[PDB]
Protein: N-acetylmuramoyl-L-alanine amidase
Amino acid sequence: SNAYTVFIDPGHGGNDKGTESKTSNRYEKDLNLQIAKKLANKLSKQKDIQVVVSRTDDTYISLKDRAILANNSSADVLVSIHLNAEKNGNTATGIETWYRNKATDGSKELAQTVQSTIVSYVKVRDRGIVENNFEVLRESNMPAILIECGFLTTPSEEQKIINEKYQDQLAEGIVQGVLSYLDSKG
Ligand SMILES: [Zn+2]
Structure:
């Protein structure tokens, strides 16, 4: 056998709505699932790739449980999909990718490759890569990143995030970043 397993984690779900648009009352949880579904479908078409997702529907899953699911799936890579939010603002734009604090396992490399590839596909503002102690990253056992796919709190970004062709481009960019990582550092 020679397959890589990619665990996709659409952030939030169920009772946890994540960020909520002030314009339109759209929820991050729903947009995360839309983007993740496109990413999952694209990865599953690749030859040596098996996809595992934390959720396929509007289900609540705790942070602890997501890391447990990822770990039990023996994934090679974890990609969590979230949207960013400004607590006191509605102007920020762009995409950034997080990895666990002081990662030595290749998470930092995965983050940079995915981030740079995304920037080439959607041509959004490059906010770079960031260390973050988010529990899903911290407690997962394999290279793990969380992509903040634009600011749902910024009306311009929301108009992109909701758009299917934009979601498709973003998902394609993520796929190519993951494959480029896996091709070189499985
Ligand atoms: Zn989130």
Notes: The two ends are 14 Å apart (CA to CA). The chain has one domain: 1-186. Residues 82 and 180 are 21 Å apart (CA to CA). Residues 164-185 form the longest helix (22 residues).
